[model samples]
Target chain A: MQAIKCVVVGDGAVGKTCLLISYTTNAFPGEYIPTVFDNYSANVMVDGKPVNLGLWDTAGQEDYDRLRPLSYPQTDVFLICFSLVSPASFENVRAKWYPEVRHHCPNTPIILVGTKLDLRDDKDTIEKLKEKKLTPITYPQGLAMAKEIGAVKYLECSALTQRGLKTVFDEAIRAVL
Target chain B: ARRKEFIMAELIQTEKAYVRDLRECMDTYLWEMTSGVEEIPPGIVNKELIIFGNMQEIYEFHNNIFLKELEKYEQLPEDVGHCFVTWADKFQMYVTYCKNKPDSTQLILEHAGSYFDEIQQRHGLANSISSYLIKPVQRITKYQLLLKELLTCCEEGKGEIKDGLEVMLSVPKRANDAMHLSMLEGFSQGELILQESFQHLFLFEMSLVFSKEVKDSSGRSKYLYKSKLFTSELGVTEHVEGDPCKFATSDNKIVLKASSIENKQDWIKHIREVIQERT
Candidate 1:
């Protein structure tokens, strides 16, 4: 079967691992696939095409900045994510995530994903954001970000409800072709 | 006799090893990410120009053409002189490769990083890409020495070897400069200076030197030593927009454009560093 490596990166709070575990049949395992490798490997069929899609999660800390790109070389596509309710994470899509991915993998396709979509409608989430004079990222804003960063698709997902989660990955797999 | 005979054999053996090494460099580093990339579902994205530095041309010349020429003289070894005489002009290609070597070195040090380092180790290559990149120039310089030794035993067709030596002396400027500057640091590096158009400038510690390309008295093109100004000898101006690459000496303003501010700043920094250090 043909194989693809999809690397996931963003600010740490944006549910990068949760997104990966949410898609995989396996739980979030303690040991990643040895040193400097695919964190989650899956064999699946997308559009009746058999492929092994290896989902790679990068450490989103400044300390791992130099160490992280070791996993970048073979990446077929990237998921640059941010929480839908966090303006800082949304702003960083332009400021940090896009720049970081394009710097290492200039031509690779990227999927711009706004995660924790459930929180965008949650009263508690809105209350927390309102304390700081913020609001949930609108769909138009996320679409605008996708255009700005040249992403293949803009998606919103809530792993809590598995809402729009499958499309987030299938679109990622589709981008590889 | 041993000296003359051995050096010719040395040419074949060393040349084969060099070709062997060049192929390994291509295969390990260049040919799939040196073979396949950035597209086939997690492949390396590389610009061939930066990573290989015109090495493919150098590799082709030796592996496909020059090595076979040398092999033909395996039985009648002294006849190898003819191949050198005929291919002396082709040796200029190595100069092209050597000039680009610095960029390849710079890129690998920065971007290639751990990916290439791991690949290098896995491939059993103890040397860095920088060392392998130097091989083309090194072989040319070594050829000059090898030919010099072979001339000692050359009583026949020695004229061809002599002509080859003349070209070898003029070629491989990279090695000669190192040998030249192993003892002297008079000047280093060339970038263009804008006068009517971009002319060559060489930066020295004490003086900023400039040259004008002119047809010499012999009617061949060469850079004439036009003038030089000490960094302390010049007044300076700040970066401008319409002519963003503008800089001035105490006597005159230099006007042109650079592609980027970062690039424009390089000249300003280097010139001002030289200027302020002395002042």
Candidate 2:
């Protein structure tokens, strides 16, 4: 049983559980429980090697930050989630959380993900984004940072739309293993 | 001791670097005895790890703390000192308290001694241990003290070296300085090295203030002078009379060769008081 301990880390209400649920169980509740870590297993093929991944979903709240070190120590890979729905989550992903995560898990591989990409084509969101001039690119600011930090790969996916979902772990596992 | 005063700064820095390298070498010796990561051995990383015993069991006891601490320091993430006792309790594993097991401390010491011998064997003139490590062994002259005071304290389950809960608790007064200033106001609980470094600098400055020269009862003249610290792009060096030059650290902090002040040994006494107040 070869396994890679993968962790889903981001601020709260970033649709982490939704992404996991949609990808692994193929179920969408449309309502998120503000996830406080619900671990799941996934089998991702890397270089044709079936690497069993145990994904530990972490809470994004300020209080849950301390518990993260405990969860992170054993982690081999990280799925850094940035919700495209809220720009603030994307900012927090780069500013507060990423440095802290890199501080602890120096050698672990990371994959940057921007969720709610389905909204990229929505008029209301586009109008609002244009008004603020906040354009949501799937691999925003952290694409370079990911490569700099030697992250496995960078990609965007929508849990509901299943857009760009298949290639999620395809690059990460190859780089990590 | 007076012969050390004549040492040049660059030479002193090089010697300091050499001694530090030796300390790291010793630490690697400790790592092979103490750490969990099988891939790295002593002298293999930026920082050296010292475990009181074997890697498998010792790492099992302290891996979480090691990871957490390594996460903070990041230079040599897995390197640190772990207590056998705490590891035993946390992992629910049994380890013969090296103190309780008399032969264990001897075995460990003998292992360390052989390294010193190897160092003297390999780089005979340039070899001496770093003062940070030397201070501890000098403090614990007896095997009993090594077990009770040193290893026992760690085994009781101290956390990371910097910002670890045990590390902070063990030295509370140092951390309290965070309360007195605004620039350091935003600091969270994890700034152990920052606090310690600041305290070391403070003590260094204070040593210069109270310096004086007097004649001892034996009719010998002694000066209560502090060593001058000089830094340049090359490295940090400490100038002590007659001593070989000491050098800069990889991180660039000038290494202070252990100093014994005047007949009263006032410098150590002063620093020890500060540590006592904090711990």
Candidate 3:
């Protein structure tokens, strides 16, 4: 089995841990999981062979910022995620996350994963954003950002609803596959 | 030509009736309940907020604004759909109402015994406010039929008419998606399910429901009950495989060939993504 190490890095609370946890486990995470972020491996079959998809979750908090990229080496792919509702988190996708991956491993492929999709079209969420003069980042914008960063793919998922949660990891294995 | 006129008229006709129904609900239940005009309790007032969210806003539009807009285009049947396009974004209000529907329904059932049944009796309303609660939901559901009827006689205004149906019909569906997903959760760790191309002939319908026939008695039947699928349980491949006109579906996991290469490519390029929050 070929093991492809995939590191997920983004601004804190953009669902870095939830993305990894939800994809591995079918259910949504109920509480804190800093320990789960350390490292985990998912076994997936791709195109006809077994693939050990190694997942690395990094803390995007300023507190752990320095200690983060120490694990960035030897990565085959990176899933740079951001919450679809948080414009600031999406902004950091280009400004912070993409550049960080390239800085550590310039040739390593990155898959841009957008989290909290269930909230994107949620009515109450929409009205809340409207009050602040903001809106959920649209698919076109996400696709554009993926292209801007030269990410290998742009996939989205909701840890709560489980919609599109599968395709994220399925595509990740195929990235190295 | 007469048929087109009547079909066009029917759209406006139903909208007039639809808005009036909205008014009946607002006046009969929402207004009296909110102001405590009918001695509505403090607890019921809060529940009323959930049950009849933004119906006042929805009522005012369909009654005063959207109704008038349609009447303006009576002479131009095909171009009438332009009204739908102008107010397209505002339709999300219906989704807001419908998404709350299940919870609203539950709340009504819980409270209907004490307050709503009496309210219905006093107001000369034959049934509970739950009946009125579903009026907004019902009005939205009929939009597709009216639009489809009008399109049969429409020779022009394809984009306007086409877009109108899409935006209007999706209101409940989007609501249903949010509602349905709220109810449930998939499996196999993303295993590719199956892959084969079946030779069923393709036909286009404004109503794009996927269905197939099955038998009763474990064996015998006509075009009776069928195994069905829709955009929800179904998904198509993003890119075409070899020989061009080929793409596959996930979950159902069947490979398919479209009528043309461009069609295959465009469908694949479809379904392309989100950001948020505060301190």
Candidate 4:
């Protein structure tokens, strides 16, 4: 019967929306849409107790830099997400998101989430990143970053295959508790 | 130049075209799909059929009155725009239909694709059928633009007609609100469908707990450390180095690695407080 307000933040196209959609609905949105502040709610049972999980989605675009923080207040926990294939988004976790979340709600716990796990080993994704002399972020790299940010935990998942998707959120609720 | 006349002419003309688009879908696409002996895609069967039924009434209403307004363009009545205001209200049903049927939107798109292809092959339309299918959705917002244009060009003293145009403008605004609402509804449905399919993943487990482990310096022995600070039952003292926050159990069984000294101190403080509370 407790309510957990979880806000997802990261650079655009990092699968934050897909992560929530996959965990909440089990479907992956087929398009790459730059989100403009959407919200989703689900009554979930976490640890055998009813919990109202309110998922707040924010835009990662520079245009919404001012407006994005409006959803930051009253946030119970934050999922600072990044795509494993995109090192730029990964860098932003330390460069942009962590500092921003810390600035607004300094005490709120953060779960550093590496998204697009299914694509980490994907041939096309690896080749695309390899073109730039990059590779998918390894689990240890993500865990190390979580430590750097002082996050409660580090997690990864594929919104497409729903693999490790549930654990990311399970850990999120657990983080707040 | 007759500015009001031009605006009214545009309004009437566009409404007629929109109605024609609706009629084409009803007569050509709906008819073929419903009447043919071929199997209808199960996705499009009953739901889309009912949606077209709702759209049919709207088409009839627009075609009749909009054409009437077009015929009497000269000396238009003060309340002439009121017809569209009412029509906009009725058209909201279609918006609601679209919102309620998110899955049907795909079927609608598929039907539009097939219908447009047929029209292109049979009637030689250089333009795509998407324009026609989209017309109904866009028509709602179009009313606001057309009516605002009407107001802009109206003579200052034409108070009654001006009042009517103003009221008519709000109709499309409401209809546009419905369109926006429908979009949100569709997004929510996508989430709901995903939620239902993965309900188990979303369900919470009762009495399930998670923990990190503390290990000896040699990594030979490991002990459980519940990460929950104040509630932790670990009997350990904290030591800090550059990166690892070490916890040493009184029985000399375990050590743990936290990221930093600050992180270690916070956990140690909470555990100490909990231990004090218990006594």
Candidate 5:
């Protein structure tokens, strides 16, 4: 079976690596890390076929975008992430980020993933979180952005709680396959 | 007190595409070395059975984004003691290291490592690695010829090609298996999980130039092999440049302007000297 290459992208501290670690190995880090360029891989079988996948966790630095396209080379899947509570990041996906990524890698499958579902309630209380969540509040807005970029599926996942992960992974695999 | 001020050389051309190409080639080469080639032959770079998507596209994407992104970093300015550049030609690509300061070396190494990790996962090196490792791909018929010639030419040139090239040919493959096994070894049930996390930030294609003076049965020769497939199995010619003798890696810089021979040797020597002098 053929292996698929996938890249996970979002702002720093958005749990890109955490979600990946949880999904790939069911492990989590104790302290918060701004990934200074960590990339990992895994193989999974769906419907009795072995499918390989690759995930590149880029450092969420302004300079890291230069390294981001390198992550999409020969890639079959792209998982664009945003913190559920941080609406600005979600807006960036539609307004700035996807536009740049799509410029270099067209015709690639992208999946819109709103991460940190566990933090939704925290967002209502924290003032900054409120601002972040205001970026995109309605399901219509989320799905709208997903449709705009040709995403196969839209999912809200909490890498911390493991909610929507298995389905997200399965759906992403199904879409790419 | 005696203190060593570390100062070294920088490369002549530091084009973004060149670095992308070089990095991709080296990374892909390593992936192939770790994973066995099952589609074609043993001696040459493997392209036919490549598991990762398209290496060229990957490099092009890598180069484009990296170039734009590098613009921001340019503000930081070149190191006071050392400077370097990246370049790629039809034959090969390289990240020319400058030894000006330990700090500079760290920066370059860090950049390379970061880029390596990106391509390893995003481009799916594990799949391509596994493709080569799990199955034994046949080498192109031209393997013996090219291997023999590569060794012969390296010997004729001023390089210790035999050992370095041999290591180049083997270590990457071994490293690939080790990377894969690293996942399995880490957790018994984590093999597949580990492979899935692999990301790739770059992919490369190689173009080896042989002098026309060194004739084939028909006549002279020019070729670009995808991955490490045999000469004949090299991808269909998408493009061709000036005739052989265009450049040589052996000729000295002084003789370059003196002699009309434009082989790779003259060009490389001139470039190296110019960059060396610039330092």
Candidate 6:
């Protein structure tokens, strides 16, 4: 089977690892484990062709900024992610994530992902954002940002609920073709 | 009793050691893996055999013929000198050794990690079997060095082995050329001519254009960042209308542009692959 490497990048605690762990294992991890680099693979069938989808998870912390792009070459696609509940994380979609992916890989396709979709409408999340004079990132905002950054698709998911989780990766694999 | 006889003995000694190492790779590791109840896949087995078989040919040549000639030559006689010349011409088998190395050294490590290690522990070898497996291949270059020594040791009147020594000296280069061509064949496919620089992180495909407007410098027109994968920090966001392809650093530290949208994405994909592999 042929292999396509899909690397996920975004702000730390944006649920980048959660999104991957949820989709690959169908079980959400209990707590966050900040990643320097972690890998996952799945045998997938797309358009009747077998594919080895290799997933690379990278740390989004500024501490790892110098080392993160080491995993950028020969990537088939990238999932630029941000937590919908965190507006600063959402802002980083364009301000930090988009520029980072673009600098290392000028031509790779990106799928803009608004993670924690289940929390976008969560009462506790809304109250927290309210105190900060912010609000959960709406779908329209994510879609607009995807267009602004030339992302192939904008997707949202919740690792807790597994909502739209599978499709996030499915679209990522399709982007390679 | 010419001093030249001692140099010939050194060649025989090195050849004997090379053959002995091959036997260890085959008998101690390869045979145990291939012969037992827990057999590896046929394809892997065949790979081992092909590599070992080529090695065996050289070992047999030295053991059966080359050793006898070295022994017979007390002072580099004419008949023994002819055999040394013959050995020199046939040393090109080392090139075959270079050509047939396992596609994934991981396979050797896999086999070596188990049975090869067992053998190493049993025999108390200083190095691992994987390192031992590499010996025969490395010993190929030593032939030229050894032959050159003999050439230097020869008196002005003695020149029988000179032509043969010259032929032997050329073997390592021929082997290298074959190996290099093989690597090129494997690496180049379709439009990608993947090349890596020691100073750079990314493997670059050469000769492409980066537009002056997006590049770090306005002076350079024919730039390398466009068509090739850049495993550096600069990321490609996307092309905005009127702006075309937009390239920028994460913190807006640096920016560059490719000539076309299609070219930009191709570089991105290639660069991503490199990054993915490292991670």
TM-score of each: 0.40, 0.38, 0.43, 0.40, 0.42, 0.41
DockQ score for model 4? 0.02
Over B1-279, each residue of candidate 2 has an lDDT whose tens digit, in order, gives 121121112222333343344345445544443453434323433333232323234343334453343234333211222332233233222112211222333343444444543443344322223212222221111112112222322433343322222432222222132221221211121232221221122233212211233456785333333343311223334455676434333674534343222412333455445444444
Report the C-alpha lDDT of model 5 over B1-279, residue by residue, as the tens digit: 011111001111123424443455446745544563433233223322232223344356435553444344343222211111221121121011101112222332343334333445566554333222111111111112223333442335343334333433332233232332322210121111101110010111121111111224564221222121111211111112542332212323211111223323433443344334335
lDDT of 4 by residue, B1-279 (tens): 366656666666655666667777677656656675556666566554443536666676677665665456445734456555544455556545334333344455554445435544565433223334434444543454455556665666663555555554444333333333222210121111000000011101111122323445675222233322223346454544444556642465555555446656654554455455546
* DockQ versus reference, model 3: 0.01
Q: Kindly report the docking quality category of candidate 6.
A: incorrect
TM-score of the A chain in candidate 6? 0.91
lDDT of 1 by residue, A1-177 (tens): 666778788876787767777677444343221112224555778899888776766532322232244346657999999999889889888987788789877899999999999889899999999999989999999999999999999999986677898899889999987
lDDT for model 5, please: 0.44
If you assessed candidate 1 against the hidden native complex, which CAPRI class would it receive?
A: incorrect
lDDT, residue B18, model 4: 65
* Model 6 lDDT on a 0 to 1 scale: 0.62
Q: Model 5 over residues A1-177: C-alpha lDDT tens digits?
A: 665667677765467767877776635543332122224556787777778665655433322232234334556777888877767678778876688668766787788988888777674546664555543344677788899878888899888878898877777778788
Q: Pick the candidate with the highest DockQ.
A: 5
- For each of the candidates, the C-alpha root-mean-square deviation to the true structure, in angstroms, is 20.5, 21.9, 27.3, 23.1, 21.6, 22.2
Clashes of each: 9, 24, 7, 10, 67, 29
lDDT of 1 at B202: 48
Error of 3 at A88 (Å): 50
> In TM-score terms, which candidate is top?
3
Reference-based lDDT, residue B258, model 2: 35
lDDT of 6 by residue, A24-142 (tens): 76345643322222355567887788887877665433323323454565588999989989998888788888898898788999999988888888898899889989998888998
Whole-model alpha-carbon lDDT for candidate 1: 0.66
Off by over 4 Å in 4: A26-37, A60-62, B1-279
Residue B138 CA displacement from its true place in model 4, Å: 22
Residue pairs clashing, model 3: A84-B274, A84-B275, A85-B275, A85-B276, A86-B275, A86-B276, A139-B273
User: Candidate 6: lDDT of A167?
Assistant: 88
